Structures are given as structure tokens and as C-alpha cells.
Design a protein around this ligand. Structure first.
Ligand SMILES: COCCOCCOCC[n+]1ccc(/C=C/c2ccc3cc(N(C)C)ccc3c2)cc1
Ligand SMILES: COCCOCCOCC[n+]1ccc(/C=C/c2ccc3cc(N(C)C)ccc3c2)cc1
Length: 581
């Protein structure tokens, strides 16, 4: 094979080749109009056709990053719009590509889409193919690390909603409830993908490799270790390419793995027949959301192969990761009730056991009791679930988010205000997703979602590092972030921020902004309130909130709102400064 660009074009097809390139251009340059990206895709698509016809043509043998970076460099508004990004084109490959990835903005500050069904159903009937591309460009631009093959899946499921709803008598009643249930699934899928790339770039290939061992052995307990390692090797490669910008190699390798899984169902799992009958994009998504398989009937006891064996040390030193991956496989297949975050926590703790036990003269007496130490790790988080869920039912979602806003602001005051608000909102959403679930299967729920939300706090904070407490928990370990953040305490080393009148100034626009925007504004002032008064008790903060609610209710109803906010505004500040002094 001499032409990489022709190999990807023939395997994926024109439609999927064009979409994946549009996604790639959207993640690299997030401040560019949609029309300009269509031109870059069309030009690169025409070049791809030429290489398939004639492979010996000049330029067909270059790497996919070279051709990609070459087109990114011809953007006339590279410097004036992206600043220092224009200096990436002054280097060679692969340093040129690494320079580009480093400029992916995880907070693109892009406008919020307010979709109305009238004009939205109109653009779909006008051009379904462009309305399809507009969704890809819009999602990829706000999530520059999105799993690209799944972006095409959601894009086709997006037209499918309009396919069925733009024909009914009430388009609004049909479209909005479907896209909202889909809006939460895409943000969930983006946060999961954002954590996978973070594992590689910050904790190494071994981190993502062990991630798949936990999930795969959990979902496929019947598959033997040699089969699980085969899938792990190819899946880690697939994700490694997507997280590295090789979207064409990523999707093509996902299809090959989706095909390999179906052609070996009898050795992997018995619940894939329905999954292995859908089209390419739907099939790959089915395998990712498939139910777990049944546990074998006569599994040998765990203690046999890694505790009572007089060769645990010997087997470990000859193949450390392979023996440890074996321990994760044996443990994940028998405990599908646990969280993936808990399994990697059990294996990481077992790793630390062998390293210190084999160092002793008689490791046998040292490592023989590891089973008791590991079992105690499962019960440590259990106490936090009850307390959080009880506070959830009492205050509700909104009252819980403001509760977490208070708890986490005193915990890490140095973190910027918009990050503290947005994170605490996601933390409050966890209660609605987990405490209502079975208390005998919810245990992973909390631990699972918390690892995806705390990762975003690290991702947001690593851009502009300002808090010493956040940096430690984010770089110490990947699996122990949740206990590292719950164990943090409000430190008396933080000096309260000086008072800012603007941070407590409000206009009549508070009565107009959308509901989400209204809450954000009210929650922003709550963060800045505690940043200035870090020692305000709960009874005082209770009084201030009720004083503000009755206030905003008063001024949003007067015939002259600006005069109400002008007069009553200073009144609240004096009363609040008096109660908090
Ligand atoms: C403030 O000025 C804004 C300018 O921004 C430019 C961004 O600066 C970054 C650092 N940097 C500095 C200089 C250059 C250009 C060198 C050059 C180019 C074309 C040339 C063509 C020639 N011909 C044969 C006609 C002869 C010499 C050339 C020499 C590029 C980048
Ligand atoms: C590079 O790879 C990583 C490094 O490998 C490290 C792996 O070490 C050996 C792991 N291991 C392998 C096999 C077994 C079970 C054996 C067994 C089976 C049936 C049995 C039937 C019996 N009956 C009489 C009914 C009696 C005993 C039996 C015993 C346990 C542990």
C-alpha cells in the first residue's frame, strides 16, 4: 500500500469520508464558518478521487496529517482569528500536528443553539444532506474531542427525528422531546470520550488499556482472556487514533472491530445476534450499549490464582501488565455489579500490594491477605451515597445544585466562577440519575458519572491552572480522583476576595433571559458570594437566598423594573453585608 488517502476513501465510502473530514476540520478550527469548511472538504474530497483513479499521482503518498495540515495552513484568516495557532505551520510533521491539537478549545464560548421547529423543519426539507452536515459541524465545533464514528451515528439519528416529525400536524410536540432526550445522550457521550483521551495524554496507554479490560470482561464474562486481550488491543488502537485526530483510521478500524466481534459471537457473547444485524453505524453503537452476559456457573474461587499460589511473585515479574490485566479480567467477569472505576481501583491497589510484598523476604505471608484489604475498598464510598441522596430528595435538583455550589466553593475557592457553577450543576444532576435507581445497582452509577464530570473540572483547570488542590487530585491518579475530591476540606489558607459591586449588580434582563440562563446568573452570584465571605454559615446563606428570591419576585412584577432594581438593589447589599459581617 502506497496511498493512505486512497485506502481510507475506498473503505469508508464518499459519504462517510466527507462527514469525517468535516468533523476533523470542525474540531481543529472551531472559529470558522460552516461554508468555508465545506470548501475545504470538497477540495480534499476531489483530491481523494484523483488518488483512487491514479495512485502514482503527486501527493497521494503523503500521510493523512500532511495533507490535512497543508489545507489548514492555506486559511487566509489563520493568524487574525486563531492567533499563535498560525505558528504551527512553521514546523514539520508530526510537530505541526501536535501544535494544532494543543489549540483545541475545550470551552469554545460559542452561542447556545435555540432550535425552533418551524425554520428547522424547513432547512431539513430544503436540503437533507446539508442539514445533515450542519449538525456534524455544530456538535464537533463545541466538542473538539468527540468520538467521530459516533458523531455520524447521532447525525443520522438526528435526521430520523425530522424524518418522522416534520410530517405530523404538530412539529413542535414531536421534535423537541426527541431532540432533548438526544441532547443529553450526546453530551454524555462527549464527556465519556473526553475522559478516554485524557487517560492517554496524561496517564499513558496502560491507563486506557486497563479501562477496556474492566468494561469488556464485565460485558463479556464468557470470553476467555486471550479473546478479551485481542479486543482490548484493537479497541485501544481505535480510541488512540480518534483522540489523536486520525478520524479516518479511527472509523475504518471501528468497522473492522465491529465486523470481527460479529464473526466470533459464539466465543464472545450470546447477546449479540440482534446487535449484529443492523447497518454499520447502528451495529457499532449496539455493541457499545449491549447488555452484560451471564456469569459462568462453575467459576473457580478468586483466591486460588493470585493469593494462595506460591508463584504469584514469579508470575508477576515475568509479565507485570499481563498478570495484572489477568487479575482485572478475572475480577471484572465475576462482579458486573461494580463500577468500572471501582475495578481499576481494586487492581491498582493490588498492584501496590505485589510491589511491596514481593520486596519483603517472605511475600507469601504479605500478599495472602490482600483479599480482605480489597473487600474493604467497596464499602468506603457507600456512606457518601446515602448522605448525598437524602440531601437530594429534601432540596430537589435546583436546591441540591446550590447546595453543592456552597460545598465546593469553600473547598477550592481559587477555581474560576464559571467553572465552579457549571461543574456543580452537573454534580447536582447526578442525583436525578442515580439515587432513584436500584440501591443494588446504583453503586456504580454515582461512581461512573462522577469520574466523567470531575475529569471535565481537571480538563477545564489544566488550561488555566490556579488551584493547588485541583492540580494535585487531577495529576496524582486517574482512578482515585473521586475520593481525592471528597476528602478535601475548606482550607483556612485562602484569603477572601475583595468586594466587587459589579459581581452583585443586576438589571431588568434577569426577568427576560431563558430559564437555564436565569439559573446560571443566580448561581454565579452565589459562587462570588462565598468567594468573598468563605465563612458564611448555612443559616446566613439560607437568609440571603430567601431575601433574593422575594426581591427578584418583587422587581420583575413592577411597572418600572429598572427603577425597582435601582432602588431595592442597594437595599439587599446593605442587609447582606450586615448579616454576613
Ligand atoms: C509584522 O508583520 C507581519 C508579518 O507577519 C508574519 C508572521 O510573523 C511570524 C514570523 N515571520 C517572519 C517573517 C516571515 C516571512 C518571511 C518571508 C516571506 C516571504 C518572502 C518572499 C520573498 N520573495 C521571493 C518575494 C523573499 C523573502 C520572503 C521572506 C514569516 C514569519
Ligand atoms: C502470561 O500470562 C500471565 C501469567 O500467567 C499466570 C497464570 O498462572 C497460572 C494461573 N492458573 C491457571 C490454572 C488454574 C486452574 C487450574 C486447575 C484446573 C482444573 C482443576 C481440576 C481439579 N479437579 C481434580 C477437579 C483440580 C485442580 C484443578 C486446577 C489456576 C491458575
Amino acid at each position: 500500500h502506497k496511498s493512505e488517502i486512497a485506502h481510507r476513501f475506498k473503505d469508508l465510502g464518499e459519504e462517510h469520508f466527507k462527514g469525517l473530514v468535516l468533523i476533523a476540520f470542525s474540531q481543529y478550527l472551531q472559529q470558522c464558518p460552516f461554508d468555508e469548511h465545506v470548501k475545504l472538504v470538497n477540495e480534499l474530497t476531489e483530491f481523494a478521487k484523483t488518488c483512487v483513479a491514479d495512485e502514482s499521482h503527486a501527493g497521494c503518498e503523503k500521510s493523512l496529517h500532511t495533507l490535512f495540515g497543508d489545507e489548514l495552513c492555506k486559511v487566509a484568516s489563520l493568524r487574525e482569528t486563531y492567533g499563535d495557532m498560525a505558528d504551527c505551520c512553521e514546523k514539520q510533521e508530526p510537530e505541526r500536528n501536535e501544535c494544532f491539537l494543543s489549540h483545541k478549545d475545550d470551552s469554545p464560548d460559542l452561542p447556545k443553539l435555540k432550535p425552533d421547529p418551524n425554520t428547522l423543519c424547513d432547512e431539513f426539507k430544503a436540503d437533507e444532506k446539508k442539514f445533515w452536515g450542519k449538525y456534524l459541524y455544530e456538535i464537533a465545533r463545541r466538542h473538539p474531542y468527540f468520538y467521530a464514528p459516533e458523531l455520524l451515528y447521532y447525525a443520522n439519528k438526528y435526521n430520523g427525528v425530522f424524518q418522522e416529525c416534520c410530517q405530523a400536524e404538530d412539529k413542535g410536540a414531536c421534535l423537541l422531546p426527541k431532540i432533548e432526550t438526544m441532547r443529553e445522550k450526546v453530551l454524555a457521550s462527549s464527556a465519556r470520550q473526553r475522559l478516554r483521551c485524557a487517560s492517554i495524554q496524561k496517564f499513558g496507554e496502560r491507563a486506557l488499556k486497563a479501562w477496556s479490560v474492566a468494561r469488556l470482561s464485565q460485558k463479556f464474562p464468557k470470553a476467555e482472556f486471550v479473546e478479551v486481550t485481542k479486543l482490548v488491543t484493537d479497541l485501544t488502537k481505535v480510541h488512540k487514533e480518534c483522540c489523536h485526530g486520525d478520524l479516518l483510521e479511527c472509523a475504518d478500524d471501528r468497522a473492522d472491530l465491529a465486523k470481527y466481534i460479529c464473526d466470533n459471537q459464539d466465543t464472545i457473547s450470546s447477546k449479540l445476534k440482534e446487535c449484529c444485524d443492523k447497518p454499520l453505524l447502528e451495529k457499532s453503537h449496539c455493541i457499545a450499549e449491549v447488555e452484560k452476559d451471564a456469569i459462568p456457573e462453575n467459576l473457580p474461587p478468586l483466591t486460588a490464582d493470585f493469593a494462595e499460589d506460591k508463584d504469584v511473585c514469579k508470575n508477576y515479574q515475568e509479565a507485570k501488565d499481563a498478570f495484572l490485566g489477568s487479575f482485572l479480567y478475572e475480577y471484572s467477569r465475576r462482579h458486573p455489579e461494580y463500577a468500572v472505576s471501582v475495578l481499576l481501583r481494586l487492581a491498582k491497589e493490588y498492584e501496590a500490594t505485589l510491589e511491596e510484598c514481593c520486596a519483603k523476604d517472605d511475600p507469601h505471608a504479605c500478599y495472602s491477605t490482600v483479599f480482605d484489604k480489597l473487600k474493604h475498598l467497596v464499602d468506603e464510598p457507600q456512606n457518601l451515597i446515602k448522605q448525598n441522596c437524602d440531601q437530594f430528595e429534601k432540596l430537589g435538583e435546583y436546591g441540591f445544585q446550590n447546595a453543592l455550589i456552597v460545598r465546593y466553593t469553600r473547598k477550592v475557592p481559587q477555581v474560576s466562577t464559571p467553572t465552579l457553577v457549571e461543574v456543580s450543576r452537573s454534580l447536582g444532576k447526578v442525583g436525578t440519575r442515580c439515587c432513584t435507581k436500584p440501591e443494588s445497582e446504583r453503586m456504580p452509577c454515582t461512581e461512573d458519572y462522577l469520574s466523567l464530570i470531575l475529569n471535565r473540572l481537571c480538563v477545564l483547570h489544566e488550561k488555566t491552572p490556579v488551584s493547588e488542590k485541583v492540580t494535585k487530585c487531577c495529576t496524582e491518579s486517574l482512578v482515585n480522583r473521586r475520593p481525592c475530591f471528597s476528602a478535601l476540606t475548606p482550607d483556612e489558607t485562602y484569603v477572601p476576595k475583595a468586594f466587587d459591586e459589579k459581581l452583585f449588580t443586576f438589571h431588568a434582563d434577569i426577568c427576560t433571559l431563558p430559564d437555564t440562563e436565569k439559573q446560571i446568573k443566580k448561581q454565579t452570584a452565589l459562587v462570588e458570594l462565598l468567594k468573598h465571605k468563605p465563612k458564611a454559615t448555612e443559616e446566613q446563606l439560607k437568609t440571603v437566598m430567601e431575601n433574593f428570591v422575594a426581591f427578584v419576585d418583587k422587581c420583575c412584577a413592577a411597572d418600572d423594573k429598572e427603577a425597582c432594581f435601582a432602588v431595592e438593589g442597594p437595599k439587599l447589599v446593605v442587609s447582606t453585608q450586615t448579616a454576613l459581617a
